[PDB]
Symmetry: C4
Subunit: 445 residues, 4 copies
Amino acid sequence: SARDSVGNTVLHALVEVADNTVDNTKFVTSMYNEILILGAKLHPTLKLEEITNRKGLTPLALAASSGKIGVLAYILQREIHEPECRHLSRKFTEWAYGPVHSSLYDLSCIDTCEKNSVLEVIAYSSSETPNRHDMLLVEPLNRLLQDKWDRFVKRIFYFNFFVYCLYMIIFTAAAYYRPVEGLPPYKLKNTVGDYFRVTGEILSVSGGVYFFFRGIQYFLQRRPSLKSLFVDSYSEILFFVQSLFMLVSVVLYFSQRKEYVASMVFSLAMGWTNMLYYTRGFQQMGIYAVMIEKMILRDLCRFMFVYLVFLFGFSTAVVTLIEDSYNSLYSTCLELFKFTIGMGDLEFTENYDFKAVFIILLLAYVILTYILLLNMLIALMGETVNKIAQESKNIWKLQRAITILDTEKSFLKCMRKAFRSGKLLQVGFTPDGKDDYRWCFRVDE
Amino acid sequence: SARDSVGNTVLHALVEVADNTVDNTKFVTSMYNEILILGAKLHPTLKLEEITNRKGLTPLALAASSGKIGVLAYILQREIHEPECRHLSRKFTEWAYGPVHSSLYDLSCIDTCEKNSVLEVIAYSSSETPNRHDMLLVEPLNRLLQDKWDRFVKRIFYFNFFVYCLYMIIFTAAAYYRPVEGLPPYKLKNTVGDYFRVTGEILSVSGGVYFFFRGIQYFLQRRPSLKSLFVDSYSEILFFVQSLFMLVSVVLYFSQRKEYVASMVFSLAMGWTNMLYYTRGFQQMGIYAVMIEKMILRDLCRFMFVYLVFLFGFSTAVVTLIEDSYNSLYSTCLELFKFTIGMGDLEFTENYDFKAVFIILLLAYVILTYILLLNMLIALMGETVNKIAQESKNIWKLQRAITILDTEKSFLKCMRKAFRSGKLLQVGFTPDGKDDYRWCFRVDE
Amino acid sequence: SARDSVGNTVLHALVEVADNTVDNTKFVTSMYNEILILGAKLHPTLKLEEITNRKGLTPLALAASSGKIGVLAYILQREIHEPECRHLSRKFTEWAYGPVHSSLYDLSCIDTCEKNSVLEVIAYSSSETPNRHDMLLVEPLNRLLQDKWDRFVKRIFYFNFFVYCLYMIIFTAAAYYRPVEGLPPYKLKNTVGDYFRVTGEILSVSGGVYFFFRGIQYFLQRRPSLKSLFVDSYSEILFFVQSLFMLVSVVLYFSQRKEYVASMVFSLAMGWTNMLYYTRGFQQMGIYAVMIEKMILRDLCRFMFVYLVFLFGFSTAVVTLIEDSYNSLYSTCLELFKFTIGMGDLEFTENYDFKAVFIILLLAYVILTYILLLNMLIALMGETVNKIAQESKNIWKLQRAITILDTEKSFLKCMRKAFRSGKLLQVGFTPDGKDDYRWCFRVDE
Amino acid sequence: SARDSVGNTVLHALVEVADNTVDNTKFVTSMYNEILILGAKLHPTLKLEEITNRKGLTPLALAASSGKIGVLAYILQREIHEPECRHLSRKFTEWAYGPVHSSLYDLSCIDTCEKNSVLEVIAYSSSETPNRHDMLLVEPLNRLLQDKWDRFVKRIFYFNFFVYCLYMIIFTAAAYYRPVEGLPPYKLKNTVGDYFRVTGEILSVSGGVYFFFRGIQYFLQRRPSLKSLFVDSYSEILFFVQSLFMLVSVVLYFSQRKEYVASMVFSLAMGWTNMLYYTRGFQQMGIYAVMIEKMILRDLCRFMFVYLVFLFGFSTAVVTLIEDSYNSLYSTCLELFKFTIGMGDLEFTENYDFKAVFIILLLAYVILTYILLLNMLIALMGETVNKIAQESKNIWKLQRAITILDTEKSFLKCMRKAFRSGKLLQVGFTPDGKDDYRWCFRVDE
Ligand SMILES: C=C(C)[C@]12C[C@@H](C)[C@@]34O[C@](Cc5ccccc5)(O[C@@H]1[C@@H]3C=C(COC(=O)Cc1ccc(O)c(OC)c1)C[C@]1(O)C(=O)C(C)=C[C@@H]41)O2
Ligand SMILES: C=C(C)[C@]12C[C@@H](C)[C@@]34O[C@](Cc5ccccc5)(O[C@@H]1[C@@H]3C=C(COC(=O)Cc1ccc(O)c(OC)c1)C[C@]1(O)C(=O)C(C)=C[C@@H]41)O2
Ligand SMILES: C=C(C)[C@]12C[C@@H](C)[C@@]34O[C@](Cc5ccccc5)(O[C@@H]1[C@@H]3C=C(COC(=O)Cc1ccc(O)c(OC)c1)C[C@]1(O)C(=O)C(C)=C[C@@H]41)O2
Ligand SMILES: C=C(C)[C@]12C[C@@H](C)[C@@]34O[C@](Cc5ccccc5)(O[C@@H]1[C@@H]3C=C(COC(=O)Cc1ccc(O)c(OC)c1)C[C@]1(O)C(=O)C(C)=C[C@@H]41)O2
């Protein structure tokens, strides 16, 4: 039961030295196996893998968190059937048929840990985990998540998506049929239309408060950092910001400001786009939402900086050039923006001098932006998509895993009765003269 | 002549265990050689391949249907020239020249089977068959398809395409010169122009009925399932829907509804587009038609969901924002759609408050859809084509095979004289003192 | 001097059996060595390589023509320095330094053959020649083409390009300042402007006649076939068609038809775009002209068929739908075309019924063409360009070779004094007691 | 201390014969190591590496300049610990831990050489250097660049970028609020607004003069040639051109010309665009600036030639065709340009005859340019990016290196206190009884 200065034991050290190469994988797995067996023989009373570091991470949890696929895949699929060693086996084989094995896996601290489980550390990783997307392909995790999806989570997720659709329809109806008199709040009339509208407004604000508190719960439970605040937590941030716009709309509504509409429409717009959160977790249709997240966070910042540099530079040049209607910098910025959307006039004003200078500026602007910068954006998108589609293919599973964990955490029964299988003695051997059962889960493959 | 619970013999089991890898192919090949020789020696009177499974599939038909290209390539190119074994040979070599062999192939259950032939099961596969595109490159099948194409089917196909062109020209003329009086049906006038118009309408409806019954015949013969209804049968579904629009147009025409025009134009719009069906089967020009069938079935659903989520979200936000002409959600949806086609005004109304909110909403919509989502679609399509052009290169041949089989099934002569080859005694050895001929087919290659 | 049943020599058989694979290349090389040595020993009086096949091609010319790059590379780089074998060597080494060799090559039947040379057959190939792009990288051919380029051809080519630019400027000026009175021809006034205009017209027609006769000379010398008329001869066809439009313009001008303008502008348009012919042969800028040729001949036919099917189908549907401006099929075709160029109105007429049907037709047309068909075009172009840029990189050199051969064939001095090198005795050994000189060409590489 | 016929030492010859292949790397490395040791044994008093070639380049500086990455990596990472040989080692190992080494590097002639340092030659290369992108990843150079970045250069660079932002804001404000009276210069009024305006103008011209003299200093220090003037020096050329426009604006302003505005706006349009120079050196956002540089220098020339050939040809054809408002060639050129930006009318005039000819010309122009040429540009850009993204990844670091060297060279303190580390005796052994210290630099890696 040795420990290091950080508080971790030797098995954590074996995890850390991993780098997921073939020879490193062989070395680390062999050292893990041998040291664990030796620890069993010297101290059969005390298990090493139960020992956490100062961060409360077991070697399995550290291997999962740090993105070590060789180590995690070894540990989760570690079958030990030797004398005085079976009692630390992670999995077993009941039926040893040729094409198919009826393996049984111990799910201790993989679903329920009460500190942090393998699924929890994988799904709630910091996004720096190099193999988190492929880490769930490890047999017990893949089959466990698929089982939990089909068992109860699929229905709950579809119900939540349906309810969100109802919420957005109600919100859209309540906002669309908003009153057009001045100075809110608006007195209710006894007509049924006002009762339906105010019910819609109340449900809209109720959903806003729900998402607001859900966002707070997420941020408090996760405590993310600014450096990775948007790289992770993107969907939760968008839902939280939607709720923020809803609540600012409520404040302005009861503060007697027309500007409540200014907030409400944004929330409404955000609300509909937030339906893409529910498309993630579908392999067929979730690709676009993941790519939108990735491109907005990664690619849109640099492109928009360059594009705005071009647009502002040429807009300032043009608005300087003209003199007298379009003399504002805003109008010129909009006119130069129109070229991007294929609606630039290319002679939008005569009130100026030096025709050649003006047309040269506009031609250079459209060549640089419309013909060149946009096509360069397309080229970079083509390259990066060609590289990352294979990653999005697994971001599917990763988001489904997050969904499963969130559903288990809520669960709406005030209980954690979400276990799958196991009612009989599992191991058949202990260092003592007893037997143990640790939530055996069967995988036929 | 052992059998299993489904009724299938050991050869079907040898097919099922295949996975088209090199070592597996060698294993199944060797097992086939051993079991066939044993069948010859123990039961020369009993054929193994004639045995069908529960679904009426022979081992050859199962190998073809299940997409086991290695096993099928072995079986169709199986040359046996050993004592007391030649009688099970599938092919022979008459001329053993250096660069070229005059191979001779058996066509039993290749074109005529009376249950289901190799060409029938390959062509009418469920599209999940992993090797359907490349499976027809197996030498006897490729040569059979090319031979039957050049011999009879090429002329018949071009005639059918020409007749369909005549049908669409007649339909276009009859619809274009429709009368403009009220309340159909319209009385035939004695002028020759109206005689031609009514003849064109009659031929148009006649072709509609023809395609309607052809669609019914297809659905009854194939019995497609909902899960694979569109990935297979796409062209037949489109022709059937065209005919459905034509027949609804006829009903509305004789039901005294102007709305018949609404159906007729759709059928017309479908009919010309359905000419792309005839474009498939030409290696050069078919590439778009195939791609269209793919891009609609795979890419359009998800893209249109995301695009409509963005469009509806920002459209309902904008229509909420404006107040007073454009106040309907439909008009705002169209105005925001116009940005996609490069015709968005970006100031299409002044009737609102909070100009900053309105322009921010429109700019965000433009960036999310026009710049990001459309270019993302382009990126994904580029990646997809980069991956799938090599498969389209052969789905050309697959569609030509479907054309050949349909032409043979119709054949319009009240006969089944559609065999490919064979006029000479073939085998040279039987376990009895006789000889056999089984439609010998020559391949000089 | 062995021959086959057709009368071609065994060397021609060795060329024909080649397939440019490594083992085949080694086999044919060894057979060439053996047969050439045997020819030297048995019949030193008569050389094998001089004997032509039935088509009048030598084995070197056949190897070049048929695209057997390994055989040609072997032959042209064949150094033989053995007893009683030097006299048939193709090349030598004067300075055998480590990093560099001063190789010396025989140019027999490389530039001057009087039947067909290696450069002539490579440059004037059928475009199916698999290695024509890389075949000119064989050391003596690449060095000779570069030598001819730098020596005299580059100046002549740039002079011709400059003169063509002058011709097009003159043609543009003469056409731009055409008279606007009725019923040509136009009587000259004594003003200087008319004299300059008629001089420009005379030079324009003179250039037209020049290009007409050059096209005829090309077609007579090459005798291209319809199946490969455009895959080769594309630039010459375009120049010929330009000249045809010019001559039709002349006929209409003197036939008292205003329609001469209709022809002239087409020639003028072609006359400018044909400058891209001179762009080929420059590595930096010749990429676009090559790709325009390739895409028009390969990709534009099928894309335009599919696009016109969509456009015509939906245009006919829409023009059927509307009733009463825009009621012609031409106007509707133009309005639907405008969507492709980002200028579709999407409500271009109110004179119709069934708003939903009309807008559904237009939206479906937009999605099918503007969003899908154009993006599928882009995807296919991306794929094919990713595959063929490496071939364009060398068709640069191929077009330069064609330019060099054309310049030699003209040469503008009434002579053929276009030899590259050699003024000294070359071989040093003959089967007789003499010595020979065969245009030695030196390469320091 | 032997030399060759050029006067360069044997080590320069060893550098020249390198080609960065593995076997060549071993060959040259072994010969270099052995000859250096032999030089130590025979002439320990005189070092070989310090000796320059005719161009003033040491073998290290030549290896860096000529792009021989293997030789440079070996030399910079050359450790010798043998008797009478360790005194010429380039680096040492202080701590020989397993996963990490505390290497110690000698920086002689890496930052300061007084003829040519490694950083100077790499950063100020001619852009033909094949390995300049990856050459800075050699351990001591990468660590030096990162150290100098974090130590003092990062703050100085961000300060300069901030000051340039302030300069452009001041320039934009001064130009935007230019007076609108006639005939400059404009008399200064005593109102505060005009004092701020004239202060902004003075600061704008001051910055222009600063950038003018900085450009002159760059061109004098580098003395670039026309053939590589733009592939290198691109940013410096753009800053110089901005300053030239500013100074021409000053001359016209004091020359009593309104046309000063024509220059000033260009400088303004230049200046904002030149902010992209500062995006290089940030990995995330510097990709677009590098891509735009490469695109403009490589692809834009050929694309614009082909595009302008098409545009001018069809504009001349159309302007010839029309007759009577659009009759100028400029107006027709603009109308045909509008198709490129998605705003072509396709019936912009009726003043012609032969509508079919006019529309055919415009449709052909659209298909050739809008559909084919632009999408061809997209395809080529996609392929280009696919190949060159890996180059841009390191061009980031290369431009950061240029920034570091420029900051050290200017440094604005009248001092050169920009050394990294080293205050103790370094070598520990010399052929004499002495010891030496040469700016020992530590790398823990
Ligand atoms: C906090 C992030 C960074 C974000 C929040 C708002 C402001 C947002 O602008 C962005 C920045 C932006 C602004 C304008 C155009 C593009 C991007 O992108 C998102 C954010 C961008 C989106 C588009 O991305 C999505 O919401 C789709 C989505 C994909 C995957 C998901 O997991 C998801 O979870 C909800 C949502 C939609 C907006 O919320 C929206 O509808 C409005 C009016 C602006 C978009 O900021
Ligand atoms: C049943 C399928 C799914 C389909 C039937 C109709 C409604 C269709 O809309 C689609 C959905 C759609 C609607 C609007 C835009 C794009 C797609 O696509 C096809 C279908 C889509 C097509 C485009 O695809 C093709 O038919 C070309 C084609 C390619 C390959 C083939 O083998 C083929 O066989 C006929 C046809 C044309 C339409 O029939 C048409 O002309 C109209 C007005 C709508 C198109 O539904
Ligand atoms: C004979 C060929 C096939 C061709 C001849 C004419 C009709 C042409 O239309 C085409 C078909 C066409 C029509 C409309 C749009 C695109 C293509 O393409 C070329 C041909 C297409 C071209 C574009 O291709 C080029 O001429 C550039 C070029 C590239 C490489 C070359 O080696 C070259 O040699 C001259 C020319 C320009 C036109 O001649 C032109 O300017 C007009 C008015 C129509 C074009 O027919
Ligand atoms: C000397 C070069 C070749 C150049 C100088 C001027 C004329 C320039 O036109 C170009 C040619 C040109 C003209 C019109 C459209 C595109 C390109 O490109 C640049 C040059 C092109 C650019 C766009 O490229 C950039 O300057 C961004 C940039 C990227 C990377 C950098 O390291 C950088 O350093 C400042 C700048 C902007 C202009 O200076 C500009 O704002 C105007 C009005 C024309 C552009 O000439």
